[PDB]
Amino acid sequence: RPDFCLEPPYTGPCKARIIRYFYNAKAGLCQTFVYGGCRAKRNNFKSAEDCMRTCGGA
């Protein structure tokens, strides 16, 4: 899986509460988090299915 899948979820500096998914390597699962709306990192998906597809959620 890509290395970016191993990074912690990143809310960023903007002040939206947009629910995104990130691959949680410790738990081995795509998990929700709050994204603030700007400066997303790559471990940030719009759906669980996108997250599983990209970050090897077998």
Binding site: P13, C14, K15, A16, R17, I18, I19, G36, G37, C38
Partner: protein, 224 residues
């Protein structure tokens, strides 16, 4: 909003929420058919809710209206956050009454020390999560350009300004984005970004609405 209070009934009748299955941003009603929000609140489908006080309990006079047009400023910069503003055209005119009405655009850019009202359903905790169902309000002053720039070296464009408290404790926070900073009946600011919420020397940064008055007018005129 961190360190704020429950807004008095009907005291912020221009506040709206942006919804896409859940409440994700705020906005301000500027016209019976137009809402101003942040560019980073852009989504391709948005339901606007108007007249909410508690977003978990329908109280009587709320209106939910789908966005017909969602128009992010074409020069919104995804890196620097410059031109962080967005217009929504509602698919139906809002009902204007005690619970719902419009806010004027600014006649001048923000002035240092002006006492302003920031409102939203953002997080009330500066660490962790404490999201309020009831609309919050915060009385806060426009900070000097000097102070804003010293808080965020190199990062504050001519289209941004800071409102709040350098001591920390009082600020806008996640889910407030796109909502209003109102000073003397005028929409001065759009809730935009910050280094966290309510931290010392990290006041909130807001889009400077005055600089977009012509863009807003032209965009509305072109889509009417």
């Amino acid at each position: 909003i961190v360190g704020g209070y429950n807004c008095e009934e009907n005291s912020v009748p221009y506040q709206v929420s942006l919804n896409s299955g859940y409440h994700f941003c705020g906005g301000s009603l500027i016209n019976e058919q137009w809402v101003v929000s942040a560019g980073h609140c852009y989504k391709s489908r948005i339901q606007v809710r108007l007249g909410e006080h508690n977003i978990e309990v329908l109280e009587g006079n709320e209106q939910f209206i789908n966005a017909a047009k969602i128009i992010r400023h074409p020069q919104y910069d995804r890196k620097t956050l410059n031109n962080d503003i967005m217009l929504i055209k509602l698919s139906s005119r809002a009902v204007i009454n005690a619970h719902v009405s419009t806010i004027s655009l600014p006649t001048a850019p923000p002035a240092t020390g002006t006492k302003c009202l920031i409102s939203g359903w953002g997080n009330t905790a500066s660490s962790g999560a404490d999201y309020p169902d009831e609309l919050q309000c915060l009385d806060a002053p426009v900070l000097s350009q000097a102070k804003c720039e010293a808080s965020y070296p190199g990062k504050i464009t001519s289209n941004m300004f800071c409102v709040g408290f350098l001591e920390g404790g009082k600020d806008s926070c996640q889910r407030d984005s796109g909502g209003p900073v109102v000073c003397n009946g005028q929409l001065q600011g759009v809730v935009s970004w910050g280094d966290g919420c309510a931290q010392k020397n990290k006041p909130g940064v807001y889009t400077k609405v005055y600089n977009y008055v012509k863009w807003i007018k032209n965009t509305i005129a072109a889509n009417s």
